[PDB]
Every structure is written in C-alpha cells, then in structure tokens.
Amino acid sequence: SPPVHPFVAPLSYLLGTWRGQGEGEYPTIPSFRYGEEIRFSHSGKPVIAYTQKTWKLESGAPWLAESGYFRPRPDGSIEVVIACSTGLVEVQKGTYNVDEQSIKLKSDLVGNASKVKEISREFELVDGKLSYVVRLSTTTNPLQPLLKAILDKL
Amino acid sequence: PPVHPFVAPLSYLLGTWRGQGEGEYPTIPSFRYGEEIRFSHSGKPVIAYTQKTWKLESGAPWLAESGYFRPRPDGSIEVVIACSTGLVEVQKGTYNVDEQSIKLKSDLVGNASKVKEISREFELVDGKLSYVVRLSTTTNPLQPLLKAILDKL
C-alpha cells in the first residue's frame, strides 16, 4: 500500500503474482516442462523485488528458486540482480520498452558458474500474460534459448 | 516438508528474526537501523534467506536483500545474495555446530566497483542471532561495517 515509486511506475504492470508453466530445452539436456510462479512486489522504493519458484509439473515437488531486484531508470535502462538456489548469481543489464511492455536483459556478470558464459532474459507481456525467454551460452555452446514460459496473472 | 539433512545442523536459523543494527565505517558517520530476517526452506538442501531493514525513527523501508544458504556436510557453506542496491555476492565459508556460528568471506562482489570484499559472520548467542559484516573498499582495508542483534519471533 505505499505508492509505486515514480521510477518503478513504468513497470507497474509486473506487480503481482504470475503462475504458469515453462519448457526447457538445450542441446545438452532432453526437453522438459516445469511449473513456475513469479511474484513482483515493492515497498515504495525505486526497486521491484522479484521472487520465483519452479516445480516438476507432474509430482509437484519443489525444483529451483531464485530472487532478486529489478532497478529501472527513467532513461529506459534497467539493471536486475538475481541469486539462484543453485548458487549462481547474475547481474543483468538492458532496457525496457514502455510501448511494447517488454524488458530485454543480457548478463554483465554470471557468478559462481564457470560452465556458463552468458545468460540473457527477455520478458514481454503478450495478451495480458507475462512471457519470457531465457537464453544461455556455455563454454560448450553458443547463446540460444534454454527456457520459455507464459504465465497468467493471479 | 521435513528439513533436508544438509539443512538440519542450521535448523536453529529457520523462522523470523527481528532486531536492530548499527553501522560505522571510517568514511560513514555512525547510524542505526531496524532489521528483520526470514530463513525458510522447502525440503531441499538450501535455506532461503530474505532480509529487510528500515529507519528507526520513521519506520521507513530502507534496503532489502535475498538469497540462499547452501550448507554441505563437510562443514562448508556457500551463500549467494542479491541486494536491492544492485550488488550481488557469492560468500564462501564454514559453519560450526559446536560454536553455533557461520563464517563467510566473499569470493565475489558483483556490480559494485568500489566494494572489494565483504565478510559476514553469524553466531547464536543466548538464543539471539548476532552478526558482524566487514567491508573493504578500493581505499579502506577489510574492517567492520555492520553489527546487529536479532530476537527470534
């Protein structure tokens, strides 16, 4: 109930809880589905808190989780910092587009994962639903899609 | 779910802690803050950590951080933290069941060009959670920055 800070207001469409499912595929793995829930919340500051958890679609058993903070600026730039339950950290930097309701991020740092070279994350509201693509590049492989999901707002 | 065996030795952390701290550093004039930390789990060998601080006078939200504690049965532990200020940390160290303590030093501080290292040491004293955070910057040696004491709710 504190007001959305003017710096966060252009991203106010994110605030709430989203739940849906994703798909992971990478040249290394065989392809898999997962349930996902993301919550974007705030406390009146110029940051949005992000928390996410995934689960195996059929058993319901908890899978992974991550959490962090989205820091939009009014020039349209944004940095996002994320810690993952696997022990990875990321600093993502990029831009947001108000007209298109999208966010395009590429990793400036991937921490504590030597096999990982870059991670990119793009969000886009499509038909009222929050969608994303995560791309990963490794010491083995080029930057390519890894995870895609579309989630409904609760 | 039940506590994972890797998590069991640190199960004393699980729940919500509330108290206050004080920060001081040769460049910063001394300041106090309120703080609340929540340690939780979902049966995996990982504890989720979320923290917030506020101004004592006004109750105004101040800073927040969140991440994960990953204890292993050799007594090692890795902690990954992302901060509302735009920092990330990978902290590595040990926990000691006897001394009820966790001692961590950063392997990595990300996105903060003048912060060089951060160490975080927790101890349960008399049932309260106490910690010390030490910081080194480009121009100041590693030394204490934050000290806090929290009561379990």
Residue-wise DSSP of A105-124:
EEEEEEES-TTEEEEEEEEE
Q: Is there a contact between A17 and A38 (Cβ–Cβ < 8 Å)? A: yes
**In a mutagenesis test of the B interface, which of A43, A85, A93 is the best target, namely the one with the most B β-carbons within 10 Å?**
A85
φ/ψ of residue A9, rounded to 5: -50, -40
Alpha-carbon gap, residue A66 to A82, rounded angstroms = 7
Alpha-carbon gap, residue B107 to B142, rounded angstroms = 14
What are the C-alpha distances in Å from B27 to residues A55, B100, B139? 46, 32, 10
φ/ψ of residue B12, rounded to 5: -50, -25
Write out the two tokens for A72.
């939009």
Q: Is there a contact between A101 and A13 (Cβ–Cβ < 8 Å)? A: yes
Between the two ends of chain A, the Cα-to-Cα distance in Å is 18
Listed in sequence order, the residues at least 6 apart from A87 whose beta carbon sits closer than 8 Å to its beta carbon are: A112, A113, B68, B70, B78, B80, B90
Residue among A116, A117, A41 at smallest CA distance from A86: A116
Alpha-carbon gap, residue A83 to A4, rounded angstroms = 24
Write out the two tokens for A49.
């808190």
Q: Which residue of A lies nearest to B71 if distances are taken between CA atoms?
A: A87
Q: Is there a contact between A106 and A116 (Cβ–Cβ < 8 Å)? A: no
Residue among A81, A78, A80, A67 at smallest CA distance from A37: A67
Q: Is the dihedral of CA A105, A111, A113, A117 positive or negative?
A: positive
Q: How far is B65 from chain A (nearest CA, A)?
A: 7
Q: Work out the number of other CB atoms within 10 angstroms of the CB of residue B137.
A: 18
Surface-to-core class of residue A85, CB atoms within 10 Å of its CB (0-12 exposed, 13-18 middle, 19+ buried) = buried
Alpha-carbon gap, residue A7 to A27, rounded angstroms = 39
Count how many residues are written for chain B. 153
Domains and CATH numbers, chain A: 1-154 (2.40.128.20)
Count how many residues are written for chain A. 154
**Residues belonging to chain A with any Cβ–Cβ distance to chain B shorter than 8 Å:** 2, 43-45, 47, 49, 51, 53, 62, 65, 67-69, 71, 79, 81-85, 87-91, 108-109, 111-112
Q: CA angle B88-A78-A108, nearest 5°?
A: 50
Residue among B126, B133, B61, B142 at smallest CA distance from B102: B133
Alpha-carbon gap, residue A133 to B21, rounded angstroms = 40
Q: CA angle A124-A127-A129, nearest 5°?
A: 60
Q: Which residue of B lies nearest to A66 if distances are taken between CA atoms?
A: B67
Alpha-carbon gap, residue A36 to A22, rounded angstroms = 7
Alpha-carbon gap, residue B141 to A111, rounded angstroms = 24
Alpha-carbon gap, residue A54 to A65, rounded angstroms = 6
Alpha-carbon gap, residue A121 to A132, rounded angstroms = 7
Experimental approach taken: X-ray
**In a mutagenesis test of the B interface, which of A8, A54, A89 is the best target, namely the one with the most B β-carbons within 10 Å?**
A89
Alpha-carbon gap, residue A74 to A92, rounded angstroms = 17
